Structure formats: C-alpha cells, structure tokens
Design a protein around this nucleic acid. Sequence first.
RNA 1: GCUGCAAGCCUCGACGAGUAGGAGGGCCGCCGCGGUGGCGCCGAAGCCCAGGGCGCGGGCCCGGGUGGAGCCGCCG
RNA 2: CCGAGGUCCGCGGCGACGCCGGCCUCCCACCCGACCCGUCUUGAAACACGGACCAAGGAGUCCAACGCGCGCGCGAGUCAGAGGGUGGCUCGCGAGCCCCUGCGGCGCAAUGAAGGUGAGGGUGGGAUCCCCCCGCCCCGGCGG
RNA 3: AGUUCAACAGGGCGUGAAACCGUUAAGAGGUAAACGGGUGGGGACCGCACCGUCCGCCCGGUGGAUUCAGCCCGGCGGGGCGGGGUCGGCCCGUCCGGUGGCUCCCUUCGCUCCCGCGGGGGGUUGACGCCCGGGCGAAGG
Lengths: 180, 52, 125, 147, 118, 348
Amino acid sequence: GVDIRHNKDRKVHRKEPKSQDIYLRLLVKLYRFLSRRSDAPFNKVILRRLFMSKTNRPPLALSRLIRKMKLPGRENLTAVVVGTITDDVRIQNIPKLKVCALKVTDRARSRILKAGGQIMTFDQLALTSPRGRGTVLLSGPRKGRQVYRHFGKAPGTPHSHTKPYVRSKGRKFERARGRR
Amino acid sequence: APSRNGMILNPHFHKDWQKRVRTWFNQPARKIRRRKARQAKARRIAPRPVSG
Amino acid sequence: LRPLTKPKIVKKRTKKFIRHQSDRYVKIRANWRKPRGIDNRVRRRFKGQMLMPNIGYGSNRKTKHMLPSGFKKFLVHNVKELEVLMMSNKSHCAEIAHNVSSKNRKLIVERAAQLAIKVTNPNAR
Amino acid sequence: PTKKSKTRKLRGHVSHGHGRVGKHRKHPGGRGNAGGLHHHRINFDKYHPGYFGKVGMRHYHLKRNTTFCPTINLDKLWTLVSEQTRVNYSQKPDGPAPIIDVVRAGYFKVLGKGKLPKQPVIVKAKFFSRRAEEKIKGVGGACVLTA
Amino acid sequence: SPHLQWMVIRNSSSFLIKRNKQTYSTEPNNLKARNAFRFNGLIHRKTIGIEPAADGKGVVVVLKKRSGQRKPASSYGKITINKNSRATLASVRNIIRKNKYRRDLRMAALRRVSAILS
Amino acid sequence: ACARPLISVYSEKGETSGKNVVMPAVFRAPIRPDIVNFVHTNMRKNKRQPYAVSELAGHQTSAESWGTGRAVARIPRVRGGGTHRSGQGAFGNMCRGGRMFAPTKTWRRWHRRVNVNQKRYAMCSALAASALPSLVMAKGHRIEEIPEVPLVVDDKVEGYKKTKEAVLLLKKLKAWNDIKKVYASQRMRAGKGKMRNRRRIQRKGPCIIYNEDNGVTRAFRNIPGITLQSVSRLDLLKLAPGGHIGRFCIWTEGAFRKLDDLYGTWRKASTLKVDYNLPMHKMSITDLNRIIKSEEVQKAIRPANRKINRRVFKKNPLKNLRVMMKLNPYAKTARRRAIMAHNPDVKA
RNA sequence: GCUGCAAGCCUCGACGAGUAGGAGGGCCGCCGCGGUGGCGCCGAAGCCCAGGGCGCGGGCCCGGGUGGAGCCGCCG
RNA sequence: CCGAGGUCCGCGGCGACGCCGGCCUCCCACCCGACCCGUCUUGAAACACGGACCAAGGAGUCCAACGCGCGCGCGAGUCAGAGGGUGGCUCGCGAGCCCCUGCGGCGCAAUGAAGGUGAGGGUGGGAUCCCCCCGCCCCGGCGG
RNA sequence: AGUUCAACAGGGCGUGAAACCGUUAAGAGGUAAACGGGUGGGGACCGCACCGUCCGCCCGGUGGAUUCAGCCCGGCGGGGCGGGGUCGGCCCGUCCGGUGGCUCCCUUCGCUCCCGCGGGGGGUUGACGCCCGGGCGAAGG
Ligand SMILES: [Mg+2]
Ligand SMILES: [Mg+2]
Ligand SMILES: [Mg+2]
Ligand SMILES: [Mg+2]
Ligand SMILES: [Mg+2]
Ligand SMILES: [Mg+2]
Ligand SMILES: [Mg+2]
Ligand SMILES: [Mg+2]
Ligand SMILES: [Mg+2]
Ligand SMILES: [Mg+2]
Ligand SMILES: [Mg+2]
Ligand SMILES: [Mg+2]
Ligand SMILES: [Mg+2]
Ligand SMILES: [Mg+2]
Ligand SMILES: [Mg+2]
Ligand SMILES: [Mg+2]
Ligand SMILES: [Mg+2]
Ligand SMILES: [Mg+2]
Ligand SMILES: [Mg+2]
Ligand SMILES: [Mg+2]
Ligand SMILES: [Mg+2]
Ligand SMILES: [Mg+2]
C-alpha cells in the first residue's frame, strides 16, 4: 500500500449551475467555450459566478456601482456584474452608466436608461467583448446579509459582538445575567 | 435537548391541542354561503341598497 | 445477420452473487443484500466465504449489455418502435415484448426482415 | 416529498442513523428547555447570555399604539414626492420650494442620516432630530411642526 | 432560437424513447432516429427528411422551406426520387452539398437512402 | 422580444380572410420550463380533498399487556373471553387489526400557495410555448397540417351553437387529427383507480380560448379533448397539462386582441392587471451558433486543437536500440566503438 | 468516415480496507395522480420452470406451462 | 525498420443434428478454503441472549415554530390575508382569474431599566481590468 | 357417460404461492448436512454450413435484358448574411421631427359655497394614441 490520506481528494467546487434555468445554462454553454479557447482571464471568472448561488451573487445597488465607476481610470468601461442591479432610492444622479448584468430591477432599468445609459446581457457582452476588454467586473456585499451577524465566536464570550438568536428584541429577552 | 447555536423555542403544545383543531376546509364553501345570502337579501330589499 | 463486429466478450465473473445464508432458509431469497452485522464473516470478507459485489467486477464499457451474438437488446411493442432501429441495425437487435399478441407479433417479424433488423425471438408463438 | 427523504436510503441499516452504542431513546436530556441551569448551563451561558434573571421596570398596561413613532431619514426624504417634482424645483431655486408632509406619508420623526440634495424644501413632521434640522437649514428650507 | 428549444426537448418530449440504456427519437424529420441537437427534426430551420414513397418504389426527400417557419402546412417540400441506387444517392448528394442546405447531415442522409432502398 | 411577426386570422371555412393581427408580446416571454413545472405542482396540489384514517381505529379495544412471566411477547393483548379475539395483539402497528403507525391526520398541508407574480410568469411561459412549432408538436399534439401554429380564427366561431358547426371547423383547419388521437387514446386506467370514479382515461385535445361566450362553450362541449377557457381567466393546469408546456391552443380573433392588454408589452404595462408587465429576458441573443461563429468572437479564440494525444508506450531503452538513440544520439557511436572493440585488430 | 443525448464524447496520470456516522448516484423495486407513448380473449395481472440472456449489484428482459381481463414504458 | 502497444496478401481435421457447442443454473465426485446468523460488548462459533418452519402485516411519520444550505419570483421593498368581486357560474372548477383608500406581518435605525435621544474615509493584500515601451506576426494575436 | 370455451370451475366450487407430504424420474450416501474457489463426469432442455469466412464498395472480362444515360428544349419547385442585386413595402424596439387634441406632475394663476375647506374653466411634459419617401439594431416576417 501507499502512505497517503484521501481525506481531501475531492475539491468541493461547483462545476455546474445547480439551477435548472434554461437561459442561465445557455450562458454557461457560451462562456465554457470562451473559458477554453479565448485564453482571456476575464471569461474564467464569469464562468465561476454563473455557477454560484444567490447568496454568493448578492445584489449591486446603483450607488455602489456608480462609486466604483467614478474612480480614476474608469472613463468609458463597462460595469459587469453577475447578479441583480438593484436601485438605490437615496441617490440622485446617474452619470451615464454602461452596465451588463443578468437582471436589472424596473426602477434601476428606468434610471439607467433615462440618463442615456445602456443595459446589456451576458450574451451581448460575449459578442462585443469576447476577450472581456474594457470591462470592470464588480460584485455586491457578499458579507452583507443578516445571517453573517450571527456568525462569530459565540454570543456569550468576551469581545464577541455577535448577534444572538432571540424571538423578539425586547427588555426581558437575554439581558439579565451575562450582559451587564 | 439543545445542540448548538439556536433559538430558545416555546411551542405551546403541552395541552391536549389535538382535540381542539379547526380546519379551514369549509372556507371556500363559506364564501358561497355568504354570497348567496347577500343575493337573497338583495332581492328581499330590491328597491333599497344592499350594503345597508 | 452478423453485427458490425464480434469482439471477445470477456466477463470477470459468470456466477451470481448469492445472498449470505440463503442456502439454509427458504425465507432468505437469493437476491443480494449487503451483510451489515457486527460479526459477519462475509462482510469482513474472511477467507473461503461468499464474495461481495464490488465495482471491480464491472464489465468492459465496449461489451456491456452486449448479447452473445454481438448485438444490443431493444424492446419493441409495435412496428413503429421497430423502425427506429433501421439505422444502426448492425449494433442493435429488436426484441418483441411479451404482452404482444401472436397476431401483431408476426407483423413485427415481417417488417424487421425488410429493414434487416435481427429479432432475438423471431418465432415466439 | 418522501422520495427525496433520508429514510429512503436508511432501509437495511439497523440503527437507522442513530448509533449502536448510544441508541436513540425518548428524551435522554430532559424535555424542552430543561436543565438550563444544571446540565445545559454551558449551552445557555455561551449562546444565550442574559437568559436568566430580571432587568428593567414593569409596564403593566402597555398599548403599542401609544409608543407608535415611525422614523424616516433625510436620504430617503425625497422619496415621499415624485421624481419629477424634485427636478421641477431643482432648476428654479429662487424661493418656490416643495412642501414634503412626512406626517401624511406614514412617518412621525425625521432623522438626519443621509445627505440631502442642495434644494430648498419645507418639511412637515411631528418630531425632528438635532442634526435633521441642521442639514435642512444648511441646504435651505424650514422645519415646521405638526400635531 | 434552436438552442433555446433544445433545452426543452432534450429530456421531456413526446417522441423520446428511453429503455435498455438507449435513447431514440421518433420525429418525422430525424435521419438516424437519434436524440441529439444535430439530428432532431422539428427544431431547426433547415431539416432534411427522407421517407419512402407512397408505394414501395421511390424515395421522398422532404426539405423544410424558408418561408414556412410558423406554418406547418406550408413548411415542407416533397421530392420523390424513383431512380436507381446510384442516381438516387447522386441526386440527394447534390441537393445537400451544392445547395449548402444542412451540409452536416450529408452522409447521414445518404446512408438512410440506401437503408430504405433495401 | 422585438421579433414579432404579423399573425393572420384564418376564416371559419378555409384560408386567411385578409385580417392580420400583430403578435402579442406574451408569446415572446421567457420560456421557463422550471417555473411552469414548479407552479403546476403547487397548483394541481390545491384542488385535492383531505383523506384520513379514523382516530378511533385501533383504540376501540381495552387491552393490557400480560407482562413478564409467560412466553408471550409482552404486547397489549385483548381481555379474556371465549372468542378468538382474546389474547391477541391490539394496539401496536405490528398487530393485526391494530392501529397504524402515525395515522394520517386530516389537517396536513394539502394546499400550497404560489406567488401571484410566479403564477403569471408561469402563464406567460406557457403561452410563449404555444407559439413555437417545436414545443407543440413535441407536447404530443398532431398539428403537422394546421395552417399556422398560433391558430387565430374569426370571431364568428363564438356564435356557434351546434356541435356539427364546431366539428366542421376543426376539419377545415386540419385540427381534427388532434382529436382523432383523443379517440384512439380512450382506454381503461391501470390499477385501483377504476374503483374510484376514474375508470376511463383519455388524452388531451386542442384548447380553445375565446372572448365572448355566445355559445362557444356548448358548441365544443361534446368533442372529446376540447378545453374551452376565457381569455381573461386562463388556468395554467389546462394550458400546461402535467407541467409540460406546448398546449395546442386555438385562439379567437377577439381573444387575440385582448391578449396584448392582459399582460402588456415591454413598452407599456398592462391595463386589466394593475402594476404588471412581462418578465425581462436575461439573454437577448439565444442563438449560440450566431455568437460562437460570429465575426467578433472568431477573432478571440485559438485554433481548435483536434489532435488527440495517445499514451506513448514506454519501451526499455536498454533492451531496445532505436529508442535508445532517440533519447541519446551518442549511444550509436558509443555502441559501435564497443562492438568494434571485440574485433581482434592489431595496432602499431 | 465517425460524435456533438455538451447533463454528451474523447485523452492523460494517480488512486481503491472499513463498523458508528455523513453524502452522492440508481435506465433498482411497490402503490396512486397529472401529462405522454402503447399493449390485450390471436390471451391481461398473478403463479410455476433442469429454457435463452443482461447488469459489479438492487433487479430486469425473453421463451414454455398455467391462468382468464385488464396492464405497462417515459417526463413530472 | 530493435522506430507513435499486431498482424499474417499462413494453415489443418471435422460441419447433421448427429461424433459439435452451453459451465451460469440441475445432480454427483475430488483438491484447497470453510464454526451461526442477529445483538449488546474491550472481546461471540461461544457453556451470552432471541430464532422449529412458511406466508402476510410490521417501525423515523404528520402538525406548529426555528436555524443553515439550495431553487425561484420581485427587490428597499416584499407577501394580498381575513374578506370581496365571478365565465351566472362550477362537469373537470370547493380549482383558477381579478382587487382590496396593503389593515397588517417581516425588513428600511439603533441604543437605554427608563424619561428620552438618534447615525460622515485612510493604509496594506487583492480576482479582474486600464495604460506605456521594446521584438515577432499568418495582422488576431503572441513574448519580454 | 354427460353439461360447459373450460369440471386444470363439481358445491368453503376464480387464480391456487411457500412451508409440509405422497408418488414417479435421475443421482448419491462410514467421519451431521449445507457453503466459497477450481475443474471433471452425467443429465434435462436448447443453439448451430450445407460451402453462414463465395457479405459489401470499386474494378476487369464473359453472357441474357434494359416506359436506357450524359447533352438540349419546355414547365414546375427550391436554395442563396462570403449573392446583398439591384427596387420596395410591413411588424417591433429605440432616438429625433413635437408635426395637433386628450390624461397632465399634487403646473402656476381667476372662480357658489358650507364655516378657511372639498368642487367646475384657460396658460405650461421625460407620456399615450397619430404622421415623417426621418434615422438606427446582423431586431424581425
Ligand atoms: Mg444530539
Ligand atoms: Mg459533539
Ligand atoms: Mg452475471
Ligand atoms: Mg467486531
Ligand atoms: Mg453504515
Ligand atoms: Mg439498536
Ligand atoms: Mg445519545
Ligand atoms: Mg454509553
Ligand atoms: Mg426527540
Ligand atoms: Mg382504549
Ligand atoms: Mg419456551
Ligand atoms: Mg384497523
Ligand atoms: Mg396491479
Ligand atoms: Mg471504500
Ligand atoms: Mg398506499
Ligand atoms: Mg443482545
Ligand atoms: Mg447496555
Ligand atoms: Mg464457553
Ligand atoms: Mg429459543
Ligand atoms: Mg411482507
Ligand atoms: Mg442547529
Ligand atoms: Mg380452485
């Protein structure tokens, strides 16, 4: 026999979108052809995110997309995001965005188009930019869910700052012995 | 009973709740019973408004 | 009706995998069930005991489901399900179902002879 | 459904996924939240600190309609009016300013969290914060009250 | 959009036959009766159909027209070739190769002509 | 989406009558078989009646276990008497005539609710599949001779009042073959479903969507397989039978006009449904061969590597000669100087 | 020439014990429903067999006998 | 041809249900191996327990609530629930469709026992992308 | 003997499993019987030229037949972003030409109509229905 541990032979990486969506699996059939033959590091990152789940594809608000486009060097590039571009109602101006995403909400689609912008899809992106040139791949706040506020050391340890699971946030709910 | 991080549940199922359970299987038939009562009342007060 | 080729169909085991202690009891059918006891000889694969079906006994991928004649079996119920074997008639042979009547069974044999399709049970009634 | 269940793949395994040494029995650690201070103390003091004891005063007849006070911030303040209204008065800042009645929109108090666009605006709310009115006066506009 | 329609017919279809570790399709415009995006006959905009004639003599080469896309009654053209073995294979070969009409099913269609002529 | 041709309105007797109606945007909605299947399996679950075993079953007896002391198996046994019932197992699920394990209660979740937006999404994907020749012929309907896949007929058919006027129209539109399939499918159900008022089973036929019920429902009643539905109230369970999309629908001219107002194009929202519009497409160009073979993508991919590399079988370079000089060209020179060394030649 | 069921096919290298337990796959099996494709008094279900075979296996197909009215494949 | 793993452009006796073929299943013989399963147990072939045999039945379920992962719809919103409107119906349809001045639930603000008060970017690493120069080029890219 | 398609439906009578038993056929039996691996003997049922290594593509001669082929004329039908090929409409999306009236954004102003507040006309669009022989999209038929 051979002295080797088979504990971590399997690499747990999603190699196929767990969704049975038809249009999403067609984009996978498109970017798998580019991840093999285009020889561009952009298509290899879009292919991963087409597999990822909804929690690994968080929304991207307009304000969080506008600020990343106003950085120096993003003059006439595209804002690629594998997910939904939600609207940020507490922002006012839209500076002529050129985005490309799977879904765009009805208000975000209106504010981008009314400002003269352009909204694309991942099939049009692979048509005009097969190498992925002139793109700015963005993402949303993956650690922005309420679920991550409960993850930590423990609610009852020093320097925890972890949100405990309670039925209702009140006075008689876990504030007596250990919180003072 | 507890295993790891979770809520402290309080399911009030310590009485004999199985003897007092009301199933809403007559909910759609009760809409027809109420509606036919409004139509029957409407014909009884035909010249008068039905809402009251 | 010879097939496209007759390769050497080698089988790693021709016997059946008999269930443990199925020779001592009538209630214990010969259908294989994995022994899961704590002190079982077969499960612990002692020497001279009954063999357990592993994946190593898998037949060659080119000769799996291949009849001794070289063809592969396909169950048909009428002449419509037979004409799908018109193409690749060198690799697949038809087999008339058991619930068909002797009236319609003769029609499948006559139509299979025209399309040069082999039937495993030509004269079955 | 049951075809996707776990018991369908446990047929044949004796202990049914609950061990042979420690067999699955009926309540081996007490029912419900029992032993929260005796043999489950390590669980309650680690994930639910503050569970035992009293804290605060008792309000006997609490009516939630009395403490009803929904708040709104300055960033979402212009959501109570149309987007066209925010622009029709943005071009003419010469004194005509739109009146935003926060009370008639379902809110009571106005808080100064976000940034406000530099446009004169009159706000009607029952309560204002200190920084809420400072940002409205600085941008331009009044903070009138409503009972 | 054939690639969009294939994602609905690949597993759930009225013509799909799954048994004996095999998969066949029984659509009228399938050459090898194979379940694949290449041979499926009611999905593409250019499909080659080869069927025997009304009697035992002849070969009907059914081709899908260009204007007959959403009109099934006026979508297929029948071409009856009742000739010898070489003349029938030569006529079908020139229909596929010299018209560039479904040029990938060239040899697959030639082998179906010689299969129905016997 | 923007690929909407001009649909013609066939007369009640023959070919087109000159009336053309623009194809509503609903037929270009995203085709989502995973949405229609999810909604169907929750809507078809919503019409079923509850069944339950009586709570008194198994507990109608008074039985106490005999306990330890005798060779019985320590199970509740019926009280003494002079019957065969005395001494038999009473309560356990293993006992004959006893209670079942976990008796099926009548208050389980029979009904499942679906989001109103997902019910409309599944309806748009079911209508969009009724406009493609592939999805309808692969659904099972024999429409290989119908004049056009979206079968729009004149509003005169709404005034039909006799089945002879309805069967003749289906023979003119070549849709009678889809009904002859229904006759040949009428058979007997397999299993114990025949004892429960489900004896005879058959197949589905061409659905017919109308606008005004001036006799259309009663004119198409007695034809097996015909399912009539108003344009305003479309049930997904009858327009997508068994969860599969592609129901052959026969539309009326009046129902085709209102169909654009029920769900609305992408330019303007609907009117008969407040605050609703068609779902957007996450993929505009759904033709992979047009994107792969395009003029702009072929300039970014490498040439196809169609040379398979088999395993080079390793021969021993020490035993073999031609593979040793392949790895070491000097081996031929070192070998010749060694073979020649065994030749007894004399030097100076 | 051949395939392209891309959930497919092909190439290369290493590896393979296992109770308690976890996970995946099942064109393994039973009953019922919505679709769909059939079969049957020229003989269905069931049952029996020193008959011909398939799958590593769960099991399955065919032939013979018996039986006399219903039964099954695939997608959910 | 000591070369990307085999071919013979070599050959013989038999071929009528018999003198040929099946090796899995049936019966029998021999050689080697081979103690009875289940279960508790550090340890079971045990002088540990249950099991004479066969058939049928026989044990992880349903409801409420919670957590995490995943699929889907919409998105700072979301869910229409009680109920109402009905093809005047309703055989399938106690389904489905429609809209409630969306009441309300959960989120959009936290903190204090409470009165109450109430939220303005920098550094390092970083998928990806942008730009510049020098060579080659099948003018699309490649290499530094 | 007779009835019935059937008495392999003869009265607790459709189908008739397993345990168990009788009988017939075959074989064996001193170290309980069975079992795994290997082969041999026997048996019961099955399969297999008649040149089933004379099947198929092409080729070369021999010998019987060709509503006999290339080529040409006429009609029909179809293909043709690498046919653009010159002339033309039509549908949808979008942006202009706002080309003229209805909702107008809670748009500024005048005004019965009850004790300041709810009603009815005129002047101003990021919006529908029309028109452009006005564009634009490998957006379509
Ligand atoms: Mg535990
Ligand atoms: Mg632990
Ligand atoms: Mg075997
Ligand atoms: Mg052990
Ligand atoms: Mg286990
Ligand atoms: Mg146990
Ligand atoms: Mg335990
Ligand atoms: Mg213990
Ligand atoms: Mg428990
Ligand atoms: Mg009792
Ligand atoms: Mg005893
Ligand atoms: Mg009972
Ligand atoms: Mg049955
Ligand atoms: Mg293992
Ligand atoms: Mg059941
Ligand atoms: Mg024990
Ligand atoms: Mg113990
Ligand atoms: Mg002992
Ligand atoms: Mg005993
Ligand atoms: Mg049983
Ligand atoms: Mg937990
Ligand atoms: Mg009997």
